[PDB]
C-alpha cells in the first residue's frame, strides 16, 4: 500500500500507489557527448542536490483562487542547491514535483496542477513593464485574484486568464494532473530540462512555472476544519554545472 | 563495535560490598554487648538493593568475609601482657538454634559450622551454597503468608539465609577488649530472570515497597529550550 | 593462597584426619545377620496402632483393641481418626511416626491393615470411608457411602488393606505444621450388625496396623521432641 | 480479513489480522517429567477451563487514568475455573488476554496494555500496611488516580508511579502492547506461567497484574459518543492441579 | 503529572514555529537521564554507541 523513498540519505518521504506523469514522455538524464556548445566538461554534483526539498504548506480555503511558483528560482535559498546556483555560471537540471493534500472524506473540491514552460506574464498597466519583484518571491507562493488587478508594475492576476492571456480551461495541454479529493489525494510530475540551448544561467532564466488552480471550490460543514493543507516537494534530478578548472 | 563483557550479570553483580559493621566487648557488661548478630538479607543497604531489584528472580552462592579489629579499653586494671585474642564466628542455617546470650549452649551445637580465628592471620572467609527450598530467590513477592488472604504482605519464607553470630572465645580477667567486625558479602555464579524497571522513589522501609510520590524527572525551562548556548566568538564571527 | 575459610572448625566438615593408632590391626568383620542399610526399612514394618487411647486405656493394653459390640447398633460409628503421622496422637508413637519425627520434611503414602479378632462363626459388614484432605468427615452412613468407601465383609475375608495416598500442593509435609482439617480422615461405620450362632461371644475386636508404602522421602534431619531432658546422666 | 475462534465449543469470538505478543518468547505448556517437587501426578482439566471468559466492559473517558486487574483472582467467580480454584490446593495455568476497543475514525487516543509479573504495591501511609480488600476486587477494575491518595490501608494510586514506585514510562520492559486508535483497535498477549516453584495456591499468590493506561487522552467533538468501551477476554491455557486419589 | 510525556501539537495556524527541540546526551540531559537507557548508562563511567528515536502521532 504505502512506499517510502530515501533520497540523499537525509530525506524520507511516504507515498501511496498513484499514477505518475513523466513530462513530455522523456525522462531526465545527463548531457551526452552529442550536444554541446562549450569546452570544459561539466562537473556533476549529485551527493546533495538530489534530495527532497519540502516547501512550506499552504491553506486551501473557500475563497482562494490559485498559486504559482517560478522554477528554478523557488530553490534559491534551499541549502546546497542555492550554493551551486551562486557559485557556478551555467546549469541544467530536471525536477520531480510532489503535491499532497490532507482532506477528510467530508470535504470536496478539485485542483489542477500544471507545469507551464516559459510562462511569460503580462502587466496590469498595458503600457508599462513588469519588475522582478512582482513576478515571484523566493519560496513563497504568489496568489491569483478573482477580480482585475490595477497596479502599475504588477502581473495581471485574473484567474481565468492565468496571467498569460490564454483561456484557463485550455491549460491541460501542458503536463498536468487533477487532484479530486473524492478519489485522489496526491499528484506527481517529472519534468525534464526544456530549452533551446544546452545550458543557461539560473538567475537569468525562469525554466518553468508551477500553477495550482481550484476549479471546484472547497465546501464543508460548520464543525470541520476551515482549510485544507497543500504540501509541495521538489527533488532535483540530473543536475549539471560548468567546470572551474583549467584544461 | 566495542566490547560488552563488562555489562554481563557476573561482572555486574559480583562486586564485594560492606553490608554490616558492628562492635562487641570482651568483658563484663550488658550481655547483648558481648556478641554481634546479623540476619543475612539484601534489603538494608540501599545501594545493593537497587542493583538486586532490577531482576525478579535470582540464584547465587554467597561468599562472606569477616574483618575483625580489636583494641584495648580505657579504665582501671589494664592488662599488662595478653597472649592473643581468639574469635568464634558461627553461621546458623534456617531453622537452627539461635543464641539468646553469650556462653549459651547453642554456641556448641554440632549443626552450626563455626570458624575459630586468631589475631594476626588473614581474614576468615566462608561460602554458603544456594540454600533454599524453591528454585530461586525472589526479590518481589506479591502475595500473603497464609492462604486466608491475610497475614504479612510481601513476605516469602522461601528466601531465608540464616544468621551470623560472632563472639570472643577467650575469658578475660584483666580489663576489657572491645572489638569491631565488618562483613563483606559477594554473590557468585549469579543467574537472574525477568528484568524490571529500576526504582525512582527513595526507599522508606526495608521490609516494604512503600514509597512517596516522586516526579518522573528533572524540570526544564521550556519544551524547545535546548541546553544553554554559546557566545559569539572567532568561529561564530 | 589462604582463603577466609582456611583455619576454622566447622562441625559439619568431612576431612581426613591423622590416625591416633597406626600399626594396629583391627579385627576382621564376620557375617552377622540382619544388617540395616537405611532407616526406611524400619518404617516399612507393620506396627499395631493405639486407636483407643481414651485416657483410661493409655496405661493399659486396651489401647490397641478397637471394640466391636453386638446387640443392635443401627448405623453408629465404630471408630474414626485423622491421617497425620508424626503429629496425630494416634500415630506419633508407632514405628512410622517415630522415624518420621526425626526429619523436618517428609512425604509418601501410608498403608493400613485391619484384622478382625473374633469368633470363626461371626458374620457382619463394615464400611470404611476415606475423605480427601480438603473435605469434612462424614456425619452419617449415607454421606460416607457417597464418598470413597469400601464395604468389608468379615465372613468372606478376615483382613482388609487400604492404601491412603498422598495428594499435596507442595512435595514435602512437615511434622511441625498447623494443618488440621487439611490432612484427611478415615472412619468406620456399621453397615449391618454382628450376627453369631448360639455359643459364640457376641462382641469382638478389631486390630489396626499402619506402615509405610513403597515411596517416601525425608529431609532436614533434626532432634526428636520425644526426649525432653538435657541433663547428663550421672 | 476476519477470523472466528471457538474454544470450549461454548464460546465464539471474532478478531481481525493483528500482531500477537507471545510473552517472554515461550508458549504455555503442560508440566513435563523433568520439573517436580511433589508425588501425585497432576490431573489435567481442559474440557471447560479452556474457554473465553469475557469480563465486563469499561468506559474510557476524557478524565480517566487507568485500570488494573490481579490474576488469577479475576476469575474467582468465573464458572468452572472458580470451582477448580476452590476444590484443589495447587495450580498452574497460562493465559491469553484479548483487549478490544470500539472507537470511530473521529476519536483519538493511545493506550498501553502491560502484564507485570509479581507487581507488589505500596501503601498510602508509608508506616501502615495494605489489606486484601484494597488490592483487588473479584472481577471489577481498580482505577488509578491523577492525584495523591491519602487513605490508611489503600494502595497508592498516582498514575505516573504505577503503584510500584517506578516510572510509568519504563513499563514497556514487560510484555506489552500499544492500542493507538488511529491505526490499531485490539491487542493480544499470551502469558505463560512464571514463578520460582512449579505449583502454588491460587488464593495465596497473585501471579501477575494487567494494567491499561492511557498516555494520550481521549478527545472528540460535541456530537459524538462521550466514551469508548473496552472489552477484556481471558482464556486459560494448559491448566493443571494436584491429584486427589491414593497412590 | 502525566503531561510530561505528551508533546502537544496545536492546530490553528502556526506559521513555522518550533514544535520541540532537545540535545542528544543520554545519562546527563534532564530529558534522558531517567529513562531505561540513561539509567543503565549512569552505572558506567565510560560509554559509547548510537541512539534510536521513534516518533508516534497520536
PDB file of C-alpha atoms in Angstrom, chain C residues 107 109-110 130 132-134 162-172 179 182 215, chain D residues 36-41 87-91 198-201 242-247:
ATOM      1  CA  UNK C 107       6.172 -37.307  52.209  1.00  0.00           C
ATOM      2  CA  UNK C 109       1.716 -42.942  51.081  1.00  0.00           C
ATOM      3  CA  UNK C 110       0.556 -44.794  54.204  1.00  0.00           C
ATOM      4  CA  UNK C 130     -11.814 -42.099  53.406  1.00  0.00           C
ATOM      5  CA  UNK C 132      -9.699 -36.221  50.890  1.00  0.00           C
ATOM      6  CA  UNK C 133      -7.612 -33.519  52.609  1.00  0.00           C
ATOM      7  CA  UNK C 134      -9.960 -30.608  51.881  1.00  0.00           C
ATOM      8  CA  UNK C 162      -6.280 -49.790  52.464  1.00  0.00           C
ATOM      9  CA  UNK C 163      -3.518 -47.615  50.995  1.00  0.00           C
ATOM     10  CA  UNK C 164      -4.075 -43.939  51.828  1.00  0.00           C
ATOM     11  CA  UNK C 165      -2.412 -41.900  49.049  1.00  0.00           C
ATOM     12  CA  UNK C 166      -0.538 -38.597  49.056  1.00  0.00           C
ATOM     13  CA  UNK C 167      -2.005 -35.621  47.203  1.00  0.00           C
ATOM     14  CA  UNK C 168      -0.424 -32.387  48.394  1.00  0.00           C
ATOM     15  CA  UNK C 169       0.214 -28.974  46.884  1.00  0.00           C
ATOM     16  CA  UNK C 170       3.936 -28.951  47.671  1.00  0.00           C
ATOM     17  CA  UNK C 171       6.200 -32.019  47.703  1.00  0.00           C
ATOM     18  CA  UNK C 172       7.101 -32.190  51.423  1.00  0.00           C
ATOM     19  CA  UNK C 179      -2.598 -28.078  59.110  1.00  0.00           C
ATOM     20  CA  UNK C 182      -6.255 -30.465  55.882  1.00  0.00           C
ATOM     21  CA  UNK C 215       7.529 -44.393  48.165  1.00  0.00           C
TER      22      UNK C 215
ATOM     23  CA  UNK D  36       8.570 -31.521  40.051  1.00  0.00           C
ATOM     24  CA  UNK D  37       8.804 -31.381  43.846  1.00  0.00           C
ATOM     25  CA  UNK D  38       5.701 -33.474  44.582  1.00  0.00           C
ATOM     26  CA  UNK D  39       4.496 -37.031  44.049  1.00  0.00           C
ATOM     27  CA  UNK D  40       0.884 -37.304  42.894  1.00  0.00           C
ATOM     28  CA  UNK D  41       0.616 -36.869  39.147  1.00  0.00           C
ATOM     29  CA  UNK D  87     -11.669 -27.629  45.245  1.00  0.00           C
ATOM     30  CA  UNK D  88      -7.931 -28.069  44.608  1.00  0.00           C
ATOM     31  CA  UNK D  89      -4.851 -26.907  46.510  1.00  0.00           C
ATOM     32  CA  UNK D  90      -2.076 -26.374  43.946  1.00  0.00           C
ATOM     33  CA  UNK D  91      -2.404 -24.948  40.469  1.00  0.00           C
ATOM     34  CA  UNK D 198       6.197 -25.417  39.810  1.00  0.00           C
ATOM     35  CA  UNK D 199       2.871 -25.030  41.655  1.00  0.00           C
ATOM     36  CA  UNK D 200       1.306 -22.604  44.117  1.00  0.00           C
ATOM     37  CA  UNK D 201      -2.040 -21.797  45.711  1.00  0.00           C
ATOM     38  CA  UNK D 242      -2.771 -31.744  42.069  1.00  0.00           C
ATOM     39  CA  UNK D 243      -4.227 -35.246  42.416  1.00  0.00           C
ATOM     40  CA  UNK D 244      -6.916 -36.262  44.898  1.00  0.00           C
ATOM     41  CA  UNK D 245      -6.506 -40.057  44.683  1.00  0.00           C
ATOM     42  CA  UNK D 246      -4.351 -42.507  46.619  1.00  0.00           C
ATOM     43  CA  UNK D 247      -1.157 -43.831  45.061  1.00  0.00           C
TER      44      UNK D 247
END
